Scaffold this active site. Structure first.
Site, PDB file in Angstrom:
ATOM      1  N   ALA B 163      15.426   7.960  67.593  1.00  0.00           N
ATOM      2  CA  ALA B 163      15.139   8.785  66.428  1.00  0.00           C
ATOM      3  C   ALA B 163      15.770   8.271  65.143  1.00  0.00           C
ATOM      4  CB  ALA B 163      15.536  10.222  66.687  1.00  0.00           C
ATOM      5  N   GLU B 164      17.024   7.819  65.221  1.00  0.00           N
ATOM      6  CA  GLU B 164      17.742   7.322  64.049  1.00  0.00           C
ATOM      7  C   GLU B 164      17.219   5.955  63.648  1.00  0.00           C
ATOM      8  OE1 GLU B 164      19.306   9.415  62.523  1.00  0.00           O
ATOM      9  OE2 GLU B 164      20.901  10.450  63.577  1.00  0.00           O
ATOM     10  N   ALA B 165      16.701   5.226  64.625  1.00  0.00           N
ATOM     11  CA  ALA B 165      16.140   3.907  64.379  1.00  0.00           C
ATOM     12  C   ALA B 165      14.820   4.021  63.628  1.00  0.00           C
ATOM     13  CB  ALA B 165      15.951   3.148  65.699  1.00  0.00           C
TER      14      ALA B 165
END
Lengths: 267, 251
Positions: B163-165
């Protein structure tokens, strides 16, 4: 899409400094708020003072101490000044700060500029050429963003004298650190008097380091969300030549979105 | 549209990982605002289009599926076999169309760093990321990972590498390099300040008036120093690949 919702509020009116050429600020000369006083490029003071703070009103005016940032005229060369808002020709007080760092007087279609490299030089309205000396950035903190820059094959941009090519990213190398200025230039941390520049405006033009003194178009760069480092004037971007780091060349080339055209700021 | 977005820990490459994150980005964007991609407006969708799944395999046999809310890119449930576990604060409609033909269970904490970190007595800065920590997550969870400490710990890994990527070009470059160099890494102060300021950055961009955020965004570089952003012309802005929808700028 359907019963669409929220609209951003238009009540926002931030007061911030506006940094530009060589990191200098838009400054109301000597806190001189008398009608007609000249606006200049001054050193961004160590403390937040009034003649360096501007409110970005919702009516498109740019104010400091109530008075409006107003042009003199609508011709290339006319200086800009501080002036009572209701007394000057309305249209000379409207300004538009674009996403690319251009402050334009809609009516004249002329653009705010710092034509003089000297600290203290008066600001004028000029024809828009997307020159480094017509690039601004808002916000009280006018400090450059010192970062490394990697690209093709995960190699980092490195300054080797007046040349630049891709090399192994090495946190230790000071020749791989760059100071991204308020005017949109990419300066070498080793000598901030140098700016990444494109030799010419033609495709294939090799970009390298030259003095930032002239503030030309080839010395102003924009970091797009797609990863490119874009030249507003020549509609072109930085290109690791033929996806071949071994040629030790970064040239100017139109955006095709290939991997040799994507870059990243590593903070 | 498409939900079998898959990545396999097996014989992966920086190129295969990047292809994963690209697909994952193409799925969640529902617009552009000041040229940057923004997730869909939550009012614009029906519960049935609100969730997608990312299949993370270690082998064509061992693997898990993660339930992602396209509205904000959060992980709300994970599935292993005919068992799905839903985070304590996944929306109410979650279990309605997430892992439907499965025995669904509720976990007692949410996927908020804070709650996850409270559980895994470690912090993001302590938990290493990479193909090795991903492979273990897939194995722990599949295996019938039951421990709450370690479930919370492997969700941190999963959330960051997925998700953060998807949200930041910076974090995917990092994840991509640890893969290309077979070297695990612990998230630096920039990564964490980015993860922490997603919402703030998204708002400023969408609420900006004259190339200006109404409120400044204070990030940190690797040396752990203040990088204050408050303008669309600031270059740090470009590491943003997906924004959280906050409001449509008036025209």
């Amino acid at each position: 899409i359907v019963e669409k919702s929220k609209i951003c509020s238009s009540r926002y009116e931030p007061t911030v400094r506006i940094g530009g050429r060589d990191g200098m600020c838009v400054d109301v000369y000597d806190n001189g708020y008398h009608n007609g006083n000249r606006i200049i490029m001054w050193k961004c003071k160590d403390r937040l003072e009034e003649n360096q703070l501007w409110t970005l009103k919702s009516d498109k005016t740019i104010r400091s101490n109530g008075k409006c940032l107003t042009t003199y005229g609508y011709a290339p060369g006319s200086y800009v000044m501080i002036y009572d808002c209701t007394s000057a020709v309305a249209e000379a007080t409207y300004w538009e700060i674009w996403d690319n760092g251009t402050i334009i007087n809609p009516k004249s279609a002329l653009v705010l500029s710092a034509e003089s490299s000297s600290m203290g030089g008066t600001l004028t309205v000029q024809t828009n050429e997307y020159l480094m000396r017509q690039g601004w950035r808002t916000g009280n903190n006018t400090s450059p963003f010192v970062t490394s820059i990697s690209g093709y094959s995960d190699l980092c941009m490195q300054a080797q004298g007046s040349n630049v090519w891709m090399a192994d990213c090495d946190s230790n190398k000071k020749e791989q650190q760059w100071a991204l200025y308020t005017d949109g230039s990419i300066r070498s941390v080793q000598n901030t008097n140098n700016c990444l520049t494109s030799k010419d405006h033609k495709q294939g033009s090799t970009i390298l380091l030259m003095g930032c003194s002239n503030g030309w178009a080839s010395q102003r760069w924009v970091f797009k969300n797609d990863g490119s480092i874009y030249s507003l004037y020549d509609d072109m971007v930085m290109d690791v030549k033929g996806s071949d780091p071994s040629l030790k060349q970064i040239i100017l080339w139109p955006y095709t979105g290939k991997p040799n055209q994507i870059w990243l700021t590593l903070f | 549209e498409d939900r079998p977005i898959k990545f396999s820990t097996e014989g992966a490459t920086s190129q295969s990982y990047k292809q994963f994150i690209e697909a994952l980005r193409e799925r969640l964007r529902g617009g552009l605002i000041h040229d940057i991609p923004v997730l869909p407006d939550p009012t614009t969708l029906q519960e049935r289009n609100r969730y997608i799944t990312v299949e993370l395999s270690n082998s064509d046999t061992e693997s898990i599926e993660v339930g992602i809310d396209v509205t904000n890119a959060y992980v709300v449930a994970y599935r292993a076999g005919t068992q799905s576990y839903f985070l304590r604060d996944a929306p109410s409609s979650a279990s309605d169309y997430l892992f439907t033909g499965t025995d669904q269970h509720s976990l007692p904490f949410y996927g908020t760093y804070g709650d996850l970190e409270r559980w895994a007595h470690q912090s993001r800065q302590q938990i290493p990321l990479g193909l090795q920590a991903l492979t273990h997550g897939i194995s722990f969870f599949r295996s019938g990972g039951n421990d709450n400490e370690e479930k919370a710990r492997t969700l941190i890994v999963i959330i960051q590498m997925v998700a953060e990527a998807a949200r930041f070009r910076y974090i995917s470059n990092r994840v991509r390099v640890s893969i290309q160099t077979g070297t695990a890494f612990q998230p630096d102060a920039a990564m964490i300040s980015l993860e922490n300021n997603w919402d703030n950055l998204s708002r400023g961009v969408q609420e900006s008036v004259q190339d200006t955020f109404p409120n400044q965004v204070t990030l940190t570089n690797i040396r752990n120093e203040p990088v204050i952003v408050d303008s669309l012309s600031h270059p740090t802005v470009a590491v943003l690949a997906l924004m959280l929808f906050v409001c449509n700028p008036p025209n």
